């Protein structure tokens, strides 16, 4: 299956997602909305890819 | 033993992310009838087009989930949906 993350992206959220951003400016998740917006890069770069696999 | 913790959401977008990679379960994806009933899931797709930009491409271990999902996104577009979930224009596929 996929992520439960999917539920919250209804287009109602997404209306109100470019407000939000606005607010803001003014792990954390305290709303639905802040599903709307991709996580932050950890500190560790054994993140960072070794290489590729095709 | 082998045991750590849950993943956190970056870990596991990034999971998901790349097991787009591989084309069988993508397959399997577009051949689900509840997902494509709701937005919900074509709305996410979108959302994680966020992994194709730096600083996150850099941790992409799988390339080709990219590119799948750069097209996977723009079909969606044009893409009907039956009434079902039935994604319209692949009903003919085996």
Same mark, same amino acid.
Not at chain 1, 22 to 26: F, L, P, Q, S, V
Not at chain 2, 38 to 50: A, G, I, V
Not at chain 2, 53 to 65: A, E, K, M, R
């Given at each position: 299956t996929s992520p439960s993350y999917v539920? !919250? !992206?209804?287009q109602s959220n997404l209306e109100k997602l470019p407000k939000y951003k606005?607010?803001?400016?003014?792990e954390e998740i305290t709303c639905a909305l802040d599903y709307l917006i991709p996580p932050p890069m950890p500190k560790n770069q054994q993140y960072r890819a070794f290489g590729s696999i095709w | 033993s082998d045991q750590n913790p849950l993943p956190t959401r970056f870990e596991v977008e990034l999971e998901f992310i790349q097991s787009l990679? @591989? %084309?069988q379960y993508v397959?399997?994806?577009?051949?689900? &009838? &509840?997902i494509w009933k709701?937005?919900?899931?074509? @709305?996410?797709?979108?959302?994680? /087009?966020?992994w194709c @930009?730096?600083?996150?491409? &850099?941790? %992409?271990?799988?390339?080709?989930?990219l590119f799948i999902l750069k097209l996977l996104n723009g079909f969606m577009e044009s893409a009907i949906v039956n009434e079902?979930?039935?994604? /319209?224009?692949?009903d003919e596929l085996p």
């Open positions: 539920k !919250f !992206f209804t606005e607010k803001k400016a003014a | 990679a @591989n %084309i397959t399997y994806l577009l051949t689900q &009838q &509840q709701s937005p919900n899931f074509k @709305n996410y797709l979108k959302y994680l /087009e966020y @930009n730096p600083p996150y491409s &850099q941790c %992409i271990v799988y390339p080709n989930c079902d979930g039935l994604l /319209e224009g692949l």
